[PDB]
Amino acid sequence: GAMGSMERASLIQKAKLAEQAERYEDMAAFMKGAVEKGEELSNEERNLLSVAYKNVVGGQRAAWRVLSSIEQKSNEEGSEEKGPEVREYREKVETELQGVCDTVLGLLDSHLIKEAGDAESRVFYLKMKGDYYRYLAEVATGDDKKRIIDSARSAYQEAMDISKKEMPPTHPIRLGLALNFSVFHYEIANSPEEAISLAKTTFDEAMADLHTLSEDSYKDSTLIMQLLRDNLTLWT
Template sequence: MTGRLAFKSRSEMVEAMKRVASLDMDLTVEERNLLSVAYKNVIGARRASWRIISSIEQKEENKGAEMKLIMIRAYRSKVEQELRDICSDILSVLDTHLIPCALTGESKVFYYKMKGDYHRYLAEFATGNDKKEAAENSLVAYKAASDVAMTDLPPTHPIRLGLALNFSVFYYEILNSPDRACRLAKAAFDDAIAELDTLSEESYKDSTLIMQLLRDNLTLWTSDMQGESEVELRAENLDVEDQDVS
């Protein structure tokens, strides 16, 4: 697949990229990024909706507005089902087609990272055993991605840096482990700084942006642990975690 493609809708882009993925071939960098963007577009809006509706629900609970709460919870349940469907869809594509056909370390890291991300999205709203299972699946995928990244990609590679960014967010948000989140983010940042001379010109912008986000999160998380400020995850705010970097 080459050239610039135009899609009438986000769902059309998803379906087109699913067809490409089902060919059981290792995707090109462009195809891989199109797949990532396609699913990011459909999942991103619903994750944002879920966060907003959950915030509204909490406020209405404090007011004791029972009728409003019934409608709010019905809508939240609808959004959660859509999130489950999207995550289940891409996770099936990854497990059935993309991961088994990945030929390079770069593509393996990309797909395992993506698998970790979508299990993490499930863990964001799941409860009880469902949350535990999603978190465990996410952890396994991120660790698999990390194992390959450590041997096959340089510390300055944007995909390796993006993995460290997302994996550290997982530790902070899902496992509530700020210490491990900070250790992982700091190690990734320090390793990249030590090898800045290996940074290629084509990936300079992507890599340095993610390094800045790692440093920003470190600053915010450290401050939060010291009780100095509220945390705002910049990876989420800037939506860099699923950025189409090559």
């Protein structure tokens, strides 16, 4: 593509530099170029790909929420007619966010998921698939909203099924997947009970397997376990 003439290793080196410079749009474009080289990603490279886009879409989502909240206030009784600008600009931000999601989903479908045979790669990509459909669902308001939602559910559920069969209950990818699937239940699928049960059960099964870990793996798992606990505290 745009990154067609750059060496794969140079793209990776540059993605790491853009991360250090907090240049996440650049980071993401370098990683998209690396994926498009056609070779599978290593563990480190999957982590770079995920960080790049999560940061980019995370800035777009925060912006969309600011603008959506302004837009709703302007639609309240007694608010003065501001004209079309707030809706137009929210739509602009929304469209760009949707294009980022479509780009990630594109990479996963062409051809990351189909070549991912190990549990750690396959679950990682399926979690990303559920995440980007979930970001689409956050902004969806039309006839496709139910289908977007259930594409998020189906990707998360396939990732859960594999992670349960193939990964220990403390694996960070298993834990991060459950945390996000649990947020999907709470916030997207209007199933706060399912959200809470999943976060509880995931946390308790991780607790009971901590004993098997080195001190460095202990540190990695308890970090995400803490985020499960934060949501349980907020939700109960």
